[PDB]
Amino acid sequence: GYDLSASTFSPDGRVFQVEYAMKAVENSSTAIGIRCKDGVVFGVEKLVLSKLYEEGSNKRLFNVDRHVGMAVAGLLADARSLADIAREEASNFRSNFGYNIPLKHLADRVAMYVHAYTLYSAVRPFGCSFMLGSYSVNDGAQLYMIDPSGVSYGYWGCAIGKARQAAKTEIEKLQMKEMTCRDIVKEVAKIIYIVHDEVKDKAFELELSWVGELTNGRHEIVPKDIREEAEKYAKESLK
Amino acid sequence: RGYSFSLTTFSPSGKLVQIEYALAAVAGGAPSVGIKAANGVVLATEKKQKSILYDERSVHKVEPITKHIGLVYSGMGPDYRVLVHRARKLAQQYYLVYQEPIPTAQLVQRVASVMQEYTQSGGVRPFGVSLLICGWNEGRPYLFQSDPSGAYFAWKATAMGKNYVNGKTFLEKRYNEDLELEDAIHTAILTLKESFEGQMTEDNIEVGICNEAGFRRLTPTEVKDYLAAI
Amino acid sequence: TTIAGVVYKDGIVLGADTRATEGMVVADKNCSKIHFISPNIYCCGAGTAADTDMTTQLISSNLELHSLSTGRLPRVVTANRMLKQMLFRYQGYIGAALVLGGVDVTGPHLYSIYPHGSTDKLPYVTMGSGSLAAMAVFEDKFRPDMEEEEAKNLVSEAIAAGIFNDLGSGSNIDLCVISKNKLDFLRPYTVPNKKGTRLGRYRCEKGTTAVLTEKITPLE
Amino acid sequence: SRRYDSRTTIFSPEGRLYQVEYAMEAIGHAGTCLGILANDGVLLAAERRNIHKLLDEVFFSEKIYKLNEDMACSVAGITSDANVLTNELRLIAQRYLLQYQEPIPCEQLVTALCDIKQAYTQFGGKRPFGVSLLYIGWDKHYGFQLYQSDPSGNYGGWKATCIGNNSAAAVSMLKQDYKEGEMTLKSALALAIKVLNKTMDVSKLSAEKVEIATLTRENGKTVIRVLKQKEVEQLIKKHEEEEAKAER
Amino acid sequence: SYDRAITVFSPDGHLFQVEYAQEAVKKGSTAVGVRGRDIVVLGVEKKSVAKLQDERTVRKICALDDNVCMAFAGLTADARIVINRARVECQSHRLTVEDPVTVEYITRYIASLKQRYTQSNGRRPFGISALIVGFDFDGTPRLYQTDPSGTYHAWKANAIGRGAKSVREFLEKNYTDEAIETDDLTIKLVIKALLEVVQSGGKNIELAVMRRDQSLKILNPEEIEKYVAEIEKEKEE
Amino acid sequence: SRGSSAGFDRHITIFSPEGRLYQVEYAFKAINQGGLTSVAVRGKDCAVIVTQKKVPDKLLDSSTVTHLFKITENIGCVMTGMTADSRSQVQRARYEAANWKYKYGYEIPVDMLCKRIADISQVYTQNAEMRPLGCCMILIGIDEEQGPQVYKCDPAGYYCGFKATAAGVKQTESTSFLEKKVKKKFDWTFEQTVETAITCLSTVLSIDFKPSEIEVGVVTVENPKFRILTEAEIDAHLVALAER
Amino acid sequence: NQYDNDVTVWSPQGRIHQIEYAMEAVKQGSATVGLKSKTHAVLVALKRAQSELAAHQKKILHVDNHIGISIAGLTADARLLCNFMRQECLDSRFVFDRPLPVSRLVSLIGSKTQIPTQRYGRRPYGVGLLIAGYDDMGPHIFQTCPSANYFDCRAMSIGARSQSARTYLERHMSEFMECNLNELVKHGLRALRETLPAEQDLTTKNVSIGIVGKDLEFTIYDDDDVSPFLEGLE
Amino acid sequence: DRGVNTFSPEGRLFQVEYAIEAIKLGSTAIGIQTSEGVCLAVEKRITSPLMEPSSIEKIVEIDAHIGCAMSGLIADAKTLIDKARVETQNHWFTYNETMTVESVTQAVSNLALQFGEEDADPGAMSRPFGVALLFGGVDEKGPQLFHMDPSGTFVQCDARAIGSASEGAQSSLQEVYHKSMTLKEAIKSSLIILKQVMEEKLNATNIELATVQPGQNFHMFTKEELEEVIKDI
Numbered sequence A: 001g002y003d004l005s006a007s008t009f010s011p012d013g014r015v016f017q018v019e020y021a022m023k024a025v026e027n028s029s030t031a032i033g034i035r036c037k038d039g040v041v042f043g044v045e046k047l048v049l050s051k052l053y054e055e056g057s058n059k060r061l062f063n064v065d066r067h068v069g070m071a072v073a074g075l076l077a078d079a080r081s082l083a084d085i086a087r088e089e090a091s092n093f094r095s096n097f098g099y100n101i102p103l104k105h106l107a108d109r110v111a112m113y114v115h116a117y118t119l120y121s122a123v124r125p126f127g128c129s130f131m132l133g134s135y136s137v138n139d140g141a142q143l144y145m146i147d148p149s150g151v152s153y154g155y156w157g158c159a160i161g162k163a164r165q166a167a168k169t170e171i172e173k174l175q176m177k178e179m180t181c182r183d184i185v186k187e188v189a190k191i192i193y194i195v196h197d198e199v200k201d202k203a204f205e206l207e208l209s210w211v212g213e214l215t216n217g218r219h220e221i222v223p224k225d226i227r228e229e230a231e232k233y234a235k236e237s238l239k
Numbered sequence B: 001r002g003y004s005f006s007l008t009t010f011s012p013s014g015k016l017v018q019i020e021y022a023l024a025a026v027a028g029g030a031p032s033v034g035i036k037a038a039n040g041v042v043l044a045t046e047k048k049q050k051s052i053l054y055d056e057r058s059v060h061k062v063e064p065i066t067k068h069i070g071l072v073y074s075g076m077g078p079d080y081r082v083l084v085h086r087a088r089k090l091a092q093q094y095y096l097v098y099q100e101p102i103p104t105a106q107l108v109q110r111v112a113s114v115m116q117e118y119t120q121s122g123g124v125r126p127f128g129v130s131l132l133i134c135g136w137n138e139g140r141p142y143l144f145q146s147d148p149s150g151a152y153f154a155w156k157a158t159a160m161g162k163n164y165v166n167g168k169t170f171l172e173k174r175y176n177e178d179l180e181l182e183d184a185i186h187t188a189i190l191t192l193k194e195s196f197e198g199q200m201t202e203d204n205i206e207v208g209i210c211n212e213a214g215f216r217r218l219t220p221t222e223v224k225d226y227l228a229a230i
Numbered sequence C: 001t002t003i004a005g006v007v008y009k010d011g012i013v014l015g016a017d018t019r020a021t022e023g024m025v026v027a028d029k030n031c032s033k034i035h036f037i038s039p040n041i042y043c044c045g046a047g048t049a050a051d052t053d054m055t056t057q058l059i060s061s062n063l064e065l066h067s068l069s070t071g072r073l074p075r076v077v078t079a080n081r082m083l084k085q086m087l088f089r090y091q092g093y094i095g096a097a098l099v100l101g102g103v104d105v106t107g108p109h110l111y112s113i114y115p116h117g118s119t120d121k122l123p124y125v126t127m128g129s130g131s132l133a134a135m136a137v138f139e140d141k142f143r144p145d146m147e148e149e150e151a152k153n154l155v156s157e158a159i160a161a162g163i164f165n166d167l168g169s170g171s172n173i174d175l176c177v178i179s180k181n182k183l184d185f186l187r188p189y190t191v192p193n194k195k196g197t198r199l200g201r202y203r204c205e206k207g208t209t210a211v212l213t214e215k216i217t218p219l220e
Numbered sequence D: 001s002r003r004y005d006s007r008t009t010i011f012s013p014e015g016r017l018y019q020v021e022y023a024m025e026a027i028g029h030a031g032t033c034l035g036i037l038a039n040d041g042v043l044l045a046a047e048r049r050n051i052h053k054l055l056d057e058v059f060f061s062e063k064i065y066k067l068n069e070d071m072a073c074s075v076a077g078i079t080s081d082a083n084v085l086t087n088e089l090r091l092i093a094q095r096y097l098l099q100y101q102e103p104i105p106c107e108q109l110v111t112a113l114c115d116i117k118q119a120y121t122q123f124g125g126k127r128p129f130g131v132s133l134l135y136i137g138w139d140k141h142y143g144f145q146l147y148q149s150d151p152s153g154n155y156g157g158w159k160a161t162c163i164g165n166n167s168a169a170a171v172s173m174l175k176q177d178y179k180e181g182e183m184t185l186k187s188a189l190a191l192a193i194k195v196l197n198k199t200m201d202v203s204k205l206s207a208e209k210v211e212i213a214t215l216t217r218e219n220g221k222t223v224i225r226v227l228k229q230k231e232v233e234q235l236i237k238k239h240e241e242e243e244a245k246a247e248r
Numbered sequence E: 001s002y003d004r005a006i007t008v009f010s011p012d013g014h015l016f017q018v019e020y021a022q023e024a025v026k027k028g029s030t031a032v033g034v035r036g037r038d039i040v041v042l043g044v045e046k047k048s049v050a051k052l053q054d055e056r057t058v059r060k061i062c063a064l065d066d067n068v069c070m071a072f073a074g075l076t077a078d079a080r081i082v083i084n085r086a087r088v089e090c091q092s093h094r095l096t097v098e099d100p101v102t103v104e105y106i107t108r109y110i111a112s113l114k115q116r117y118t119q120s121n122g123r124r125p126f127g128i129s130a131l132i133v134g135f136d137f138d139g140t141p142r143l144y145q146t147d148p149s150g151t152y153h154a155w156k157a158n159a160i161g162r163g164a165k166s167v168r169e170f171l172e173k174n175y176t177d178e179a180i181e182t183d184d185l186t187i188k189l190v191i192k193a194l195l196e197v198v199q200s201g202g203k204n205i206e207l208a209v210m211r212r213d214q215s216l217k218i219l220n221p222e223e224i225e226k227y228v229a230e231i232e233k234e235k236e237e
Numbered sequence F: 001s002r003g004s005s006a007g008f009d010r011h012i013t014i015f016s017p018e019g020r021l022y023q024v025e026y027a028f029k030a031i032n033q034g035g036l037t038s039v040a041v042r043g044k045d046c047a048v049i050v051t052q053k054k055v056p057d058k059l060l061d062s063s064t065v066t067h068l069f070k071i072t073e074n075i076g077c078v079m080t081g082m083t084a085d086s087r088s089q090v091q092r093a094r095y096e097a098a099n100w101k102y103k104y105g106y107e108i109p110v111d112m113l114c115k116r117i118a119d120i121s122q123v124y125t126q127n128a129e130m131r132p133l134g135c136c137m138i139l140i141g142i143d144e145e146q147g148p149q150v151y152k153c154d155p156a157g158y159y160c161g162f163k164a165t166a167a168g169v170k171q172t173e174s175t176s177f178l179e180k181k182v183k184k185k186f187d188w189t190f191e192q193t194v195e196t197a198i199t200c201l202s203t204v205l206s207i208d209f210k211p212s213e214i215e216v217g218v219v220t221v222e223n224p225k226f227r228i229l230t231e232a233e234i235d236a237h238l239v240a241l242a243e244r
Numbered sequence G: 001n002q003y004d005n006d007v008t009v010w011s012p013q014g015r016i017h018q019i020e021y022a023m024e025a026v027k028q029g030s031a032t033v034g035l036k037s038k039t040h041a042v043l044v045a046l047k048r049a050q051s052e053l054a055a056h057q058k059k060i061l062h063v064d065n066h067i068g069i070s071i072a073g074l075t076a077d078a079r080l081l082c083n084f085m086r087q088e089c090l091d092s093r094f095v096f097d098r099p100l101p102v103s104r105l106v107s108l109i110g111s112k113t114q115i116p117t118q119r120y121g122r123r124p125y126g127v128g129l130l131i132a133g134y135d136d137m138g139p140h141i142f143q144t145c146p147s148a149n150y151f152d153c154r155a156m157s158i159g160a161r162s163q164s165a166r167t168y169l170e171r172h173m174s175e176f177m178e179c180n181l182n183e184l185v186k187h188g189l190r191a192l193r194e195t196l197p198a199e200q201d202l203t204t205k206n207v208s209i210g211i212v213g214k215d216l217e218f219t220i221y222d223d224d225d226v227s228p229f230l231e232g233l234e
Numbered sequence H: 001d002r003g004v005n006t007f008s009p010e011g012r013l014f015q016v017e018y019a020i021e022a023i024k025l026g027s028t029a030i031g032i033q034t035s036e037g038v039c040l041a042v043e044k045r046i047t048s049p050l051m052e053p054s055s056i057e058k059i060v061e062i063d064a065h066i067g068c069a070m071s072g073l074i075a076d077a078k079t080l081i082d083k084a085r086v087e088t089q090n091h092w093f094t095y096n097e098t099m100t101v102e103s104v105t106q107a108v109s110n111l112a113l114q115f116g117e118e119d120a121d122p123g124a125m126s127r128p129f130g131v132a133l134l135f136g137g138v139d140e141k142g143p144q145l146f147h148m149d150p151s152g153t154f155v156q157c158d159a160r161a162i163g164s165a166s167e168g169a170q171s172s173l174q175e176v177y178h179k180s181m182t183l184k185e186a187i188k189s190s191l192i193i194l195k196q197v198m199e200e201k202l203n204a205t206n207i208e209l210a211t212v213q214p215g216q217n218f219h220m221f222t223k224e225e226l227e228e229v230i231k232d233i
């Protein structure tokens, strides 16, 4: 059989171990990112698998540098490992070159690390996809997404996980180029509620973060009161 | 890390089949010919050259190792480039110690030894090439072949690649001890014409020669001249 | 040692004396100090003799591997980089002081290379214990764009200045002339010093030396 | 990676080492190679496989190797593997001479190489070397000597022995004709040609098809020589004259 | 470096490589040891005969040091490795303790070498068992046996290799205070034990003795056939 | 023989009975998984690279979707096949070129850079533990003696210089189109190089492009620095073509 | 099947069977319960005894003055992980002269335990932990898994028949934050007791207790010292 | 074939489970802890009258206050025993005190799962140890008996049997054990039980017995002292 190692091509030129790792991401609940006029906003549908867990447990949103947020889907231990790689890369860049890593370069460096795990029988591919978001006055708003193959692209809007396509079709309805982060958080919450399958998985927490002019280029959790207002807007919009 | 186990092993009948299969890659390669004349050696090869789009001058199958030694092959081109690089390095290492150009037979022994390694060492396949190596030293020409096992042989004349069995019998009924280099070049090109298919130009064969003055590729214009008779 | 080089209208002239010393004794009267790098590049050496020989041989060898690969004539910059990076790595412990000259696709180039790994790209240079004598000649007489014969005269004058004024330098003058069209390795160029003749004969006849034991071993 | 490892250094259920046994099948197919010990010397005689018309002839032999001043060997099996081992033999012999300032005794050289072959059957996961060797030599402890080693790293000393094609038949002929304590180089040469004449039964025997080397002592020094073709044809003549006597 | 786990457990607690190593030993030539009162004796079968063999070069009995020797059965190349390792170790002991090894010390060393090759990556077990004999500082005679697992025990007498089962049965019935009262009878007891299983008796028994302080004496075919006749003519009575 | 297989010869890079490397063959199929085709052509004055630019998703920032890469100031490339493999090979090329300049004091020749990448790919065809990269690299640059250069290397470690070449799904069809066009040309050389490249790509795909559906890169003898055309620059070529 | 022997082999469903199998090692361990109030974090563990004459396996381990753990699964993996935790705590006191925050220690476990899940020939850790701690952010209960995931918990139970314990803990968890220590430990014991066969009861031989809080370094109670907590389950 | 660090679907390491099955091929050993000391008793399992019975050593001294009885693949036990000895001497060297029985057992038990073929040194352990161990001794906690198996699980026991007949022997131990039992009673009980479970007729040469007491160091019973205890049994 042709699907047991990342160092084996199938007869049609596929690497099935990388495809299987992608299926782990596609079984995960949905995360979205949206770039707008003055920043980037992340939202995650965080399935609560037990009421015994604390609010906040198993975060899927990370700070990887002071100016860079990361949003993940897939196998969470793999994602955390990648967040640590992203953090080390940002730190090392600052030590060596003396300034904050540009988002695109950070995306490309971590993507090459992901890519290195798709060539060998000695290791397996990462079972995670992740988005990286930043803002600065010089570079503007940037949103990148990286998948288990190590492909990296930039986006206006992005979704990963199991309701990816349904999320993208809602994201396409927004004129995000002309909206502010404060406007977009409500729309992120709205979209998560739309694609959430309330019959099949019973309980979720909405996780929100942002980076933009309004945070002075620092990646930060959306404040509690703004999150609750966005949820309330999303829920009533569902009606 | 690297796989540390051999990928070539003995079969129940005592064969190293990976080496046999490496020889089948050689047998399906483009034809090569070497002829040792009295006063020199000629190496010649067919280009597996489809398109007019190829820049024929951009890569060479006939290559210098030193001022006085050259090589051609049949089989897998990229494997050949490895061996060319190692042969050049082996020749220079010898020169640094002894301050004398490496004797042709010494260079063949060291290159053949590298090929042997790849039949036993961990996590690698053998080379899918056989080499024809020419040189001049001690006032005399040398022609050697080195196979994927690391076995080497000295020849007066031989053929390798596609249709080699026939090419060897063509040379058997045509080579003589007292033959000159210019005549040898002609019979080498005739040997390739036996199995060519395409119409020969100076752009789809490559010829190298070795004599007292050293090893060099013939130029397109020189090959054109030899092709007028053929 | 006195070694020197000049850039002239169409090329490079390199020069060297032929004395090697051990302390204040002449060990070699006819040492060759102008070393092959590639067919278009040569290098004079001063300092520790084993280090100049081995360093130039190694670089020449690595350059031949380079040119075999590229299929092109090597560049003088490439020899310069290779030499200086190796010498820097050894922190001055390799006592090679070099005058590197050649002619490549970008024309003539001349460099001095020091043991610690600094290099200077210049139209005339000198090195060795005779280098200030040779440099005085150059400062007094160099002109840009000299003709071949003028440049050859100037280099041999400069080497001669070192030969006659430095106790470390002596014997013959060797030159190497490099242009786009020609390489003239002139060893010797001049022989300005000659051993005087022997006045008495000391041809000792057989039996002059008393012998305790003898064994003849015949060979094939 | 466990899926692709053919596990060359493990036991089979009957306590066997398959790769060693298979390498021994390779050797059985290679050129016949015999050694014969005499009172005044030792010899090696080998079938040549390099016999095509167009071959060039550049070395002094095909399968006979000088190891040091006092020793030579011949090989049957994979040629490239033989080149590795014979290079290692020469190194071992020079390491000894460096250390002790005397030649390595024959059995000590054989044993040293056999320990390398043994290691390849026990650890490292590599294929063994596909070579058997006959060693001839003189040393000051046991004089003229002949040894045989195989890919298991086993060896033994012999008065006469054969490896390679038709070994079993060759050994029977030696068993019957060899005179313990009474052989000379001249009669060992006759017997070698007799044996090769029967075991190269595809087909008629010729000087182009065999290689003979002798090891003797002359004026306190060891002489190792590869017989010229003139001499080999003369011995073939004498054997053919001798078979004309066989009945009346 | 090759790090494959070669010796592993199977269901039911078997170590198959070790069991297969023991199969190798069982196809080796028979070897026998008896511990006398003030002598120890080793004898071994065959192996091939073969007139054109130089006999000296294939002995299966080996000095480890002045006061310790061994015989083996199984893979002869493997045995040569073990023997040389044990010879090195005997010289370390002398170096650091300034006494010769006890027979138990070097046995324990050989056994733990064997055990390590059943539990280390990249290696197969040694396909040999050994009989190890000699004398301790205080004159006490010793006979130990090791096997591929690394297990070892002391014995009054023992056999390893092919036909060890029946040779051991013979020894169990024939080893008494009477049969080892002297040196000649101890030696004969070993020859009788071999001459049961030994194909074309014999001919191809190799035999060696060690006396208290006296170092290893191997017997020659003339000295062996003296004993053979001296037992064969006694078995008519 | 004829498609025969023994042991693990379809899983790792060991020889099949015919002397094939199936895993290397399969890396060539991987190049086509991307669904894209690239073309490159050289004349006396310039060399050009043209490739398809597919942006199916509206939510992509299309300025980040490219297969054209600067290797050095003077060497450009187009990558075809698996994207992450391609990026890795671009990084390696960049590293090799920079290292060459540091060690030798002059810019790496295009032929040498292509050879080096090919030699690195060769290793993956002989060592069992890693797969080949399922991508193909085409390099362009100006050589001071030989003029504009186009070089291509592949997952087998083969490489060659070309008058023109192609990669990806319609490689074979592009090769025929380019072959037929050069035979007509005197001294077998292309003259209108950007137009040949775009026409070839447009014929073999049957598309008739908008300026946002292709990317174009160039090096010229007068301007050796690798340059990427803008949309408007590309549009001028598309309009000049449309009008004869 | 072809997908279940190597931690490096993804199945076609996007799962890693070796990790799932490692999690079965924890489900078959004896049950343990962890819970917290505003001021204390408690661990309660059932100890399995091989025979009637064996002591009963330790389930609760000291990590630092402010941290202790309860284990389920392979005991040797539990010790290896506990030794790693101890060392990380010692390092933090050595360098910074203050206790390692509990959430940072748990992150270090996640990162350490993830590594062998991605390399050929390595295996997951076959142990699950309940971690009780107290720091500047108050009491904590964390859970760690062989998948290298971890969870921040109001309360938790792992091991055999722990579903029953979890059901009890959900039923009463609105009470925990305001409980005095005695009330909180009683709740832990009642949860653990739900895991038992109907015949059998909590005794001083089979219950082990661990407690840490604002005024109390991590302390283990066994044998006669658990009696105060068991009397008055009234 | 699969790797040595593969979990089964039930959450166990195959290699460890298989090593546990190897313990059942060993001779029976018994340990009993009393307030007056611990005793260790083991079946020798003699396979030929030509074998020297004193060369079978299945009970060993670790230190003056600690003995160890083993069952299973005995050759495997040597490195564990040596590690125990070295550890107690290190502890003495460093701390000038005796190491507890529990601590010794713990140190040895940390070797248990240190096997595998792609983390470790050029020829590290390829498999677990096919050995079970009873450590019996006296420290400031008083007399103590600990059991360890190839999983690296260790635990204190009042009485425990290991090896071929351990079921059987463990049942008789439940029947006869009591917390206030004397050492002399424990010694008799363990010989009575060995006598039942052994295939051979028990005698003074085919068993070994040792004690450790608060007064007295590790003591192997002599032939003559075994004969005395055997009279009643």
Ligand SMILES: *[C@@](O)([C@H](CC(C)C)NC(=O)[C@H](CO)NC(=O)CCCCC(C)C)[C@@](C)(O)CO
Pocket: C001, C002, C019, C020, C021, C022, C023, C027, C028, C031, C033, C045, C046, C047, C048, C049, C050, C052, C128, C129, C130, C167, C168, C169
């Ligand atoms: C030169 O620098 C001369 C150059 C050298 C390449 C010949 N250097 C030497 O002669 C040095 C000066 O110490 N001597 C040696 O390295 C000792 C080896 C000489 C003996 C022969 C075997 C070469 C001058 C200016 O130093 C010469 O005086």
Ligand SMILES: [Cl-]
Pocket: A025, A026, A129, A159, A160, A161, A162, A164
């Ligand atoms: Cl996704």
Ligand SMILES: [Cl-]
Pocket: B002, B003, B004, B005, D001, E002, E003, E004
């Ligand atoms: Cl490996």
Ligand SMILES: [Cl-]
Pocket: B084, B085, B088, C068, C069
């Ligand atoms: Cl090269």
Ligand SMILES: [Cl-]
Pocket: B066, B067, B091, B092, B095, B100, B101, B102
């Ligand atoms: Cl050379």
Ligand SMILES: [Cl-]
Pocket: B064, B215, B216, B217
């Ligand atoms: Cl050339």
Ligand SMILES: [Cl-]
Pocket: C077, C080, C081, F105
């Ligand atoms: Cl420079």
Ligand SMILES: [Cl-]
Pocket: D068, D069, D070, D097
């Ligand atoms: Cl010698």
Ligand SMILES: [Cl-]
Pocket: D068, D069, D070, D093, D097, D102, D103, D104
């Ligand atoms: Cl010698």
Ligand SMILES: [Cl-]
Pocket: E113, E116
């Ligand atoms: Cl060892």
Ligand SMILES: [Cl-]
Pocket: E025, E026, E129, E159, E160, E161, E162, E164
């Ligand atoms: Cl046996």
Ligand SMILES: [Cl-]
Pocket: F098, F101, F102
């Ligand atoms: Cl640079």
Ligand SMILES: [Cl-]
Pocket: F185, F189, F190, F191, F192, F193, F196
């Ligand atoms: Cl055109």
Ligand SMILES: [Cl-]
Pocket: G028, G029, G030, G071, G072, G073
């Ligand atoms: Cl548990």
Ligand SMILES: [Cl-]
Pocket: G073, G074, G075, G076, H151, H153
């Ligand atoms: Cl366990």
Ligand SMILES: [Cl-]
Pocket: G145, G147, G149
């Ligand atoms: Cl989990």
